[PDB]
Amino acid sequence: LVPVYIYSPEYVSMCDSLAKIPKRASMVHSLIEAYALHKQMRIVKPKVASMEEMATFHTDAYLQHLQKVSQEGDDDHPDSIEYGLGYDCPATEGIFDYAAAIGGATITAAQCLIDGMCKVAINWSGGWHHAKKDEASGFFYLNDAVLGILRLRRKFERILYVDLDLHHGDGVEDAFSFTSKVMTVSLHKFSPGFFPGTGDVSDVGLGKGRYYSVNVPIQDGIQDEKYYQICESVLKEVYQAFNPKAVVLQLGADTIAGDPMCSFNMTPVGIGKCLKYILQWQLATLILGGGGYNLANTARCWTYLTGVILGKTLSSEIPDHEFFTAYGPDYVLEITPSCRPDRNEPHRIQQILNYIKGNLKHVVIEGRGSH
Amino acid sequence: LVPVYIYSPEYVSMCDSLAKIPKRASMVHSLIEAYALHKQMRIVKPKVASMEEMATFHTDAYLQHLQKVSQEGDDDHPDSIEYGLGYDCPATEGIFDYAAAIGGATITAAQCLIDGMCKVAINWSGGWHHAKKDEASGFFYLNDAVLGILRLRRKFERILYVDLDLHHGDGVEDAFSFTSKVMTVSLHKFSPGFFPGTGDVSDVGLGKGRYYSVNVPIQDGIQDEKYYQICESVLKEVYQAFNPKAVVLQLGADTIAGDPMCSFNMTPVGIGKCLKYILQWQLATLILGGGGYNLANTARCWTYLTGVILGKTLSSEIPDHEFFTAYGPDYVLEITPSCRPDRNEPHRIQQILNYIKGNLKHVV
Numbered sequence: 001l002v003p004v005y006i007y008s009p010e011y012v013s014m015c016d017s018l019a020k021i022p023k024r025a026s027m028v029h030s031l032i033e034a035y036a037l038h039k040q041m042r043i044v045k046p047k048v049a050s051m052e053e054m055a056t057f058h059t060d061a062y063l064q065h066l067q068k069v070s071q072e073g074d075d076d077h078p079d080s081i082e083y084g085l086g087y088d089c090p091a092t093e094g095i096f097d098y099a100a101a102i103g104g105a106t107i108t109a110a111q112c113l114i115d116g117m118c119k120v121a122i123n124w125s126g127g128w129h130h131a132k133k134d135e136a137s138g139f140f141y142l143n144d145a146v147l148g149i150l151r152l153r154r155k156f157e158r159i160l161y162v163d164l165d166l167h168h169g170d171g172v173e174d175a176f177s178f179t180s181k182v183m184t185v186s187l188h189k190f191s192p193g194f195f196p197g198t199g200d201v202s203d204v205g206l207g208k209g210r211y212y213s214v215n216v217p218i219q220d221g222i223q224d225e226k227y228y229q230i231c232e233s234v235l236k237e238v239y240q241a242f243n244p245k246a247v248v249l250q251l252g253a254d255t256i257a258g259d260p261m262c263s264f265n266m267t268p269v270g271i272g273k274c275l276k277y278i279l280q281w282q283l284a285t286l287i288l289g290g291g292g293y294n295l296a297n298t299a300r301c302w303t304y305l306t307g308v309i310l311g312k313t314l315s316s317e318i319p320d321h322e323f324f325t326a327y328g329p330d331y332v333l334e335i336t337p338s339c340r341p342d343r344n345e346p347h348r349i350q351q352i353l354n355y356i357k358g359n360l361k362h363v364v365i366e367g368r369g370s371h
Numbered sequence: 372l373v374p375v376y377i378y379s380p381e382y383v384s385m386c387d388s389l390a391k392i393p394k395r396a397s398m399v400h401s402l403i404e405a406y407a408l409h410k411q412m413r414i415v416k417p418k419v420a421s422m423e424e425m426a427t428f429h430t431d432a433y434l435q436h437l438q439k440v441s442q443e444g445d446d447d448h449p450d451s452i453e454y455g456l457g458y459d460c461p462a463t464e465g466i467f468d469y470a471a472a473i474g475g476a477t478i479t480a481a482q483c484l485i486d487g488m489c490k491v492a493i494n495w496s497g498g499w500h501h502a503k504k505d506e507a508s509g510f511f512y513l514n515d516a517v518l519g520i521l522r523l524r525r526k527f528e529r530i531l532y533v534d535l536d537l538h539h540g541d542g543v544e545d546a547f548s549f550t551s552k553v554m555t556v557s558l559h560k561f562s563p564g565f566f567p568g569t570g571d572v573s574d575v576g577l578g579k580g581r582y583y584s585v586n587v588p589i590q591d592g593i594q595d596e597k598y599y600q601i602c603e604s605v606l607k608e609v610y611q612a613f614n615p616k617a618v619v620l621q622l623g624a625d626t627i628a629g630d631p632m633c634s635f636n637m638t639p640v641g642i643g644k645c646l647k648y649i650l651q652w653q654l655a656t657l658i659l660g661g662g663g664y665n666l667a668n669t670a671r672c673w674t675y676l677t678g679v680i681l682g683k684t685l686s687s688e689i690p691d692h693e694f695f696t697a698y699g700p701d702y703v704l705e706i707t708p709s710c711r712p713d714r715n716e717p718h719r720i721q722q723i724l725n726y727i728k729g730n731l732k733h734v735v
């Protein structure tokens with residue numbers, strides 16, 4: 001079918017106001033439009049999440065606080081720190097609207113998958129995977145990934161969450177840590193001192209969800225080839241062991257070379273092969289954005305990935321558009337890896353893969369109501 | 372005889388409004404106050420920099436552009452992007468006031484050194500070393516470090532600028548890249564892709580300023596002892612060859628273990644050891660802050676350093692105060708290094724030191 005593209009001019013404008021990534025939404029969309037990729041997609045206007053929809057994960061008390069702060073702006077409300085607001089997650093005007101819009105956008109995309117409208121639905125402004133039920137975290141206030149998965153859960157019994165952001169998707173993993181309906185897989189930088197500090201290979205979920213959480217700790221400097229070897233290896237084992245019926249894929253672009261966080265050393269081509277491998281499963285796939293703080297590079301990456309979804313090859317020259325001047329000095333779509341070492345010892349990587357393969361041996365495929 | 376401490380309730384309050392580091396000024400000050408360190412210091416209220424004083428480095432067109440944005444906002448002004456305003460340096464109300472306040476505080480501190488008022492003057496909310504003469508850069512809109520050096524030049528023949536921030540102090544180095552009367556030494560993370568991307572060991576300044584710029588490219592995971600070995604080794608040769616008459620020291624705390632940038636693996640003790648070595652010279656020293664994005668750790672670091680300057684030993688236990696709850700889970704002054712590898716191979720490090728020693732044979 002034709003992939004669904006969650007978009008409206010109001011939605012993009014709303015997302016443009018996110019304090020940590022100002023104007024990133026417009027840069028991403030305008031580049032995608034400049035390559036005319038929206039013409040080959042089914043543009044679907046996002047619905048704003050209702051209170052009840054957001055409440056599927058978040059507590060009423062926290063949501064009401066976000067609502068209060070959203071009006072009164074950045075006063076120093078006595079309870080804001082308790083709800084994770086502050087440095088990482090600024091308590092400014094309109095944050096409840098931003099939450100409701102992004103959350104609802106991911107829910108809308110999920111509903112498109114359910115209603116069989118498409119096999120792939122895209123919400124590049126989604127993918128905020130840190131927020132807890134009662135606490136903002138990691139640059140955002142709501143966990144739209146969880147809300148998307150919870151929506152898909154209405155129809156799908158086995159859901160695979162794949163998180164390729166530079167950071168560990170702790171919020172999503174924690175949300176489903178005790179259940180086996182949702183398997184979380186996160187490839188991320190894992191290093192003492194690095195946010196959020198969780199997600200070692202030994203972290204496998206708890207209770208009845210034990211072994212239904214997969215973590216792949218990776219060090220600085222990893223490039224396309226080695227990343228894909230790890231990803232395909234893990235994903236092949238996961239697919240075989242878990243047999244998912246629907247996929248939610250987070251594609252945070254803070255792994256891409258040039259990102260100020262300067263950790264991984266990836267290009268969108270590498271992420272693209274991971275995406276390709278997931279696509280050929282031909283399952284309902286919910287595509288999400290996430291981190292990405294080299295704004296022009298993030299637009300580069302997600303535009304390319306959009307092209308991969310459409311099975312189209314894009315021209316190297318960045319076409320003229322609103323933000324053309326931000327693509328200097330070369331004004332091309334390709335991204336060149338930085339000249340720095342890959343700190344990943346192959347035998348450590350292999351040991352990690354071995355642990356994971358062993359963990360997945362414990363994974364069964366049971367139907368609703370088993371035994 | 373007693374160190375000058377640049378402070379006023381209004382100054383700290385204004386610095387709290389900096390977008391990239393909210394509340395950090397109050398956290399630093401309240402912890403210093405909680406240790407009663409301000410009682411052993413001479414509290415000097417900072418004066419606001421005038422357009423003339425800021426003009427000693429920054430162009431009038433840029434300065435007037437800041438004031439326009441500061442009195443209005445980001446009305447998508449077409450020239451803002453050219454003046455460095457944007458992602459790193461947001462164009463909001465009050466940015467001119469912020470710049471004038473911090474610049475004027477570094478100038479006030481420098482003026483204290485001149486008036487024989489002290490041998491150490493401190494401006495923790497200063498140390499913003501990236502901004503160009505006509506362009507905002509690196510989380511701030513003004514180069515207060517440069518403005519401080521220029522003020523000291525009204526008295527001292529030779530100024531040594533030591534930059535121990537995680538990032539290359541490119542704004543300062545570039546401002547004095549052609550001159551021999553100001554020498555810049557910067558220890559920083561140097562790795563392709565890491566801001567600002569400059570400051571290799573081969574970069575030594577230009578023209579008459581050749582060899583009067585020192586850069587020490589360091590990799591991730593460096594801890595206290597190795598760092599001080601490098602810093603002492605460099606500053607030993609520098610002091611012996613350049614013979615400074617005044618020192619401007621930038622102590623950005625983004626090198627400290629626990630910083631979200633997660634690059635270096637330092638504790639305030641290692642930095643303090645570098646600071647003691649500089650204070651040993653007994654020259655007029657201008658203390659500056661800078662980076663530091665683990666806000667509690669930054670307060671921890673600069674409170675400790677304030678104690679080093681006063682020659683005092685602080686209690687291990689964080690005393691109760693306004694931000695006490697932010698000091699968990701251990702509530703202690705000391706910071707523990709992260710269990711990360713040091714990526715600095717000793718051969719490359721020693722080769723860098725030789726290269727620097729070689730360059731320092733031309734300075735006389």
Ligand SMILES: O=C(CCCCCCC(=O)Nc1ccccc1)NO
Nearest residue numbers: 138139165167195290291292631664
């Ligand atoms: O994309 C992300 C990043 C959100 C978490 C941010 C971690 C905290 C951090 O990096 N803070 C920081 C970095 C640089 C300067 C100041 C603060 N997660 O998926």
Ligand SMILES: O=C(CCCCCCC(=O)Nc1ccccc1)NO
Nearest residue numbers: 260293509510536538566623661662
């Ligand atoms: O401390 C400083 C300021 C450094 C400014 C670094 C700008 C690049 C950067 O780190 N950007 C960034 C990081 C995380 C999230 C968003 C942007 N200088 O010494």
Ligand SMILES: [K+]
Nearest residue numbers: 163165187188
């Ligand atoms: K991840």
Ligand SMILES: [K+]
Nearest residue numbers: 176179182212
């Ligand atoms: K699970």
Ligand SMILES: [K+]
Nearest residue numbers: 534536558559
């Ligand atoms: K430095």
Ligand SMILES: [K+]
Nearest residue numbers: 547553580583
């Ligand atoms: K110089």
Ligand SMILES: [Zn+2]
Nearest residue numbers: 165166167291
């Ligand atoms: Zn991330």
Ligand SMILES: [Zn+2]
Nearest residue numbers: 536537538662
């Ligand atoms: Zn810095």
